[PDB]
């Protein structure tokens, strides 16, 4: 049959400053050090572009959230000027990129996807 998530690629939401921003709420915790979408408001460019709550950010506005901090994620968004691109993944999508040794960057959703048995793909890990 047809599989709803056989195209396992991160969704890209593009929104621009409307009211006091892009229309999404980022939550920060002393347990979850990374940033995640807490809430989206109906009348927002974020909601319109297909962003939801409880979505997690892997890249924002072309910047990679590879262990990035609160200041880093804000820097990525603010550097976009008046508009931003949000990459979010659900647990199903998140695990796939991890197991394939790759960050779910925008290049994967638009272009090529990695492969299993990722011993053939020479990941550049050296030193301990």
């Amino acid at each position: 049959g047809i599989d709803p998530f056989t195209m396992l690629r991160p969704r890209l939401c593009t929104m621009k400053k409307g009211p006091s921003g892009y229309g999404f709420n980022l939550h920060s915790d002393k347990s979850k050090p990374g940033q995640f979408i807490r809430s989206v408001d109906p009348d927002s460019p974020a909601e319109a572009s297909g962003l939801r709550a409880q979505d997690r950010i892997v890249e924002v506005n072309g910047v990679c959230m590879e262990g990035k901090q609160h200041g880093d994620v804000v820097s990525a968004i603010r550097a976009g000027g008046d508009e931003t691109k949000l990459l979010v993944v659900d647990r199903e999508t998140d695990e796939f990129f991890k197991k394939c040794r790759v960050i779910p960057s925008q290049e994967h959703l638009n272009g090529p996807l990695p492969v299993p048995f990722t011993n053939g793909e020479i990941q550049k890990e050296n030193s301990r």
Binding site: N25, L26, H70
Partner: peptide
């Protein structure tokens, strides 16, 4: 606290 955008 949070951060809204």
């Amino acid at each position: 606290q949070d951060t809204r955008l």
